[PDB]
């Protein structure tokens, strides 16, 4: 299990997230690490879900191929028979460090970034639920009286934040008219893909929060960050699903109910039980196995 990185001033650190390390390789190269970590509550555990992040970076990786004539993404192609060791400094091929990397990391180009999270949504959940039920709007959006907790929209829809939920028209202030409309039209073909991709494998993916950058020589939407995985998503179990009650979370009910059980949602430095850490992962190999169609032997 990785927690942590420590590759010992090899490459600068650029940032550590809840789950990700990002270190810089060259002026327009990063280094993406996904770590093992896990959260819950806003709250990062004590201890890890083992393999979580090699899980995590295979998923996405997927999508970047299933999605690769729809968009240009920022991976580094990496020739045929090298491995990203060989575009990496020696030394990070030594034991100590290469076990710590390999199979969780990408090599990504560095792009200009557009500043928003574009969220997309198919379903009528969360923030989006509680804002409807009190006023009728979605992010300002007027919307259809008579939807039911967790109900499909008529079509999925943007629904920006900056965090601070916004509508539409405040994301086109913020990054200009013409880029949001262009980002608001890619990012919703996008999910619309994905969302029923996976429907027909039997998972239900609510919502996403996708992030893209732009080659302003080429003037292109590139996609960036991590993409549709159980972290950046919501997802649901297909079989469970039920409209006007609210669903389980795929990957963290078994979690977040132990937690809330215990009075330790929110709370700092707590540890998962041994079951909860197995319960957890055997979910992450579920939906890799059954969105890829790959095999994971451990």
Request: hydrophobic share 35%; proline share 4%; with cysteine.
């Amino acid at each position: 299990s990785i927690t942590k990185t420590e590759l010992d001033g090899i490459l600068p650190l650029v940032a550590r997230g809840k789950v990700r390390d990002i270190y810089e390789v060259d002026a327009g190269t990063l280094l993406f690490v996904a770590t093992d970590r896990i959260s819950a509550y806003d709250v990062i555990m004590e201890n890890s879900i083992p393999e979580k992040g090699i899980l995590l970076t295979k998923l996405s990786e997927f999508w970047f191929k299933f999605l690769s004539n729809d968009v240009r993404n920022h991976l580094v192609d990496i020739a045929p028979g090298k491995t990203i060791f060989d575009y990496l400094p020696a030394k990070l091929s030594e034991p100590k460090y290469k076990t710590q990397l390999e199979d969780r990391s990408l090599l990504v180009h560095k792009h200009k970034l557009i500043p928003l999270e574009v969220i997309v949504r198919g379903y009528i959940t969360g923030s989006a639920w509680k804002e409807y039920v009190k006023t009728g709007t979605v992010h300002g959006l007027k919307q259809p009286q008579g939807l039911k907790e967790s109900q499909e929209f008529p079509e999925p829809i943007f629904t920006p934040s900056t965090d601070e939920n916004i509508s539409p028209a405040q994301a086109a202030e913020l990054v200009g008219e013409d880029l949001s409309r262009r980002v608001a039209e890619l990012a919703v073909k996008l999910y619309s893909k994905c969302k029923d991709y996976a429907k027909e494998k039997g998972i239900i993916i609510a919502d996403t929060k996708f992030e893209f950058g732009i080659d302003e020589k080429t003037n292109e939407i590139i996609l960036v960050d991590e993409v549709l995985t159980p972290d950046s998503s919501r997802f649901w179990n297909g079989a469970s699903y039920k409209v006007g009650e609210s669903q389980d979370s795929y990957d963290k009910q078994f979690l977040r109910d132990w937690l809330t059980a215990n009075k330790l949602n929110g709370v700092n430095g707590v540890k998962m039980p041994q079951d909860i850490v197995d319960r957890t992962r055997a979910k992450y190999i579920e939906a890799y196995e059954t969105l890829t169609g790959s095999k994971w032997s451990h």
